[PDB]
Each structure stands twice: as C-alpha cells, then as structure tokens.
Amino acid sequence: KHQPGGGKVQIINKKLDLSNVQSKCGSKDNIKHVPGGGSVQIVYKP
C-alpha cells in the first residue's frame, strides 16, 4: 500500500511486501531468517 513510497505510486513490490503487517524491516521475529548476528539459530540465511 504505502510501502511503494506512496499509495498514488505503486512499484508492484507491494505484493511482495506484507504491507502494514511488515512494520519492522522484516516480518515477525526478523522473518526468523537469522543468518547469524540476527540471533544465530538457523545460521543459514534464507
């Protein structure tokens, strides 16, 4: 919606973006894509 930088202008990326749900730079719990510094768990950057 606003992720494109303005509802009036759409970069189509909106579909990729969750939108307001995204809030944080990533999804909930950092998309749990933790590569290492994120929390060192999966340690396999998705």
Swiss-Prot record:
Expressed in neurons. Isoform PNS-tau is expressed in the peripheral nervous system while the others are expressed in the central nervous system. The modification Phosphoserine is found at S19, S27, S39. The record marks K1, K8, K24, K28, K32, K45 as: Not glycated. There is a cross-link at K1, K15, K32, K45 (Glycyl lysine isopeptide (Lys-Gly) (interchain with G-Cter in ubiquitin)). Changing P35L: In FTD1; most common mutation; reduction in the ability to promote microtubule assembly; accelerates aggregation of tau into filaments. Glycans are attached at K14, K15. The modification N6-acetyllysine is found at K15, K24, K32, K45. It comes from the Eukaryota. The modification Deamidated asparagine is found at N13. Tau/MAP repeats lie at residues 9-39. The modification N6,N6-dimethyllysine is found at K45. Transmembrane segments: none annotated. It is found in: Cytoplasm, Cytosol; Cell membrane; Cytoplasm, Cytoskeleton; Cell projection, Axon. Changing G7R: In FTD1; increased aggregation propensity and altered binding affinity towards microtubules and F-actin. Coiled coil: none annotated. Phosphorylation at serine and threonine residues in S-P or T-P motifs by proline-directed protein kinases (PDPK1, CDK1, CDK5, GSK3, MAPK) (only 2-3 sites per protein in interphase, seven-fold increase in mitosis, and in the form associated with paired helical filaments (PHF-tau)), and at serine residues in K-X-G-S motifs by MAP/microtubule affinity-regulating kinase (MARK1, MARK2, MARK3 or MARK4), causing detachment from microtubules, and their disassembly. Phosphorylation decreases with age. Interacts with MARK1, MARK2, MARK3 and MARK4. Interacts with PSMC2 through SQSTM1. Interacts with SQSTM1 when polyubiquitinated. Interacts with FKBP4. Binds to CSNK1D. Interacts with SGK1. Interacts with PIN1. Interacts with LRRK2. Interacts with LRP1, leading to endocytosis; this interaction is reduced in the presence of LRPAP1/RAP. Promotes microtubule assembly and stability, and might be involved in the establishment and maintenance of neuronal polarity. The C-terminus binds axonal microtubules while the N-terminus binds neural plasma membrane components, suggesting that tau functions as a linker protein between both. Axonal polarity is predetermined by TAU/MAPT localization (in the neuronal cell) in the domain of the cell body defined by the centrosome. The short isoforms allow plasticity of the cytoskeleton whereas the longer isoforms may preferentially play a role in its stabilization. The tau/MAP repeat binds to tubulin. Type I isoforms contain 3 repeats while type II isoforms contain 4 repeats. It is linked to In Alzheimer disease, the neuronal cytoskeleton in the brain is progressively disrupted and replaced by tangles of paired helical filaments (PHF) and straight filaments, mainly composed of hyperphosphorylated forms of TAU (PHF-TAU or AD P-TAU). O-GlcNAcylation is greatly reduced in Alzheimer disease brain cerebral cortex leading to an increase in TAU/MAPT phosphorylations. This is Microtubule-associated protein tau. It comes from Homo sapiens.
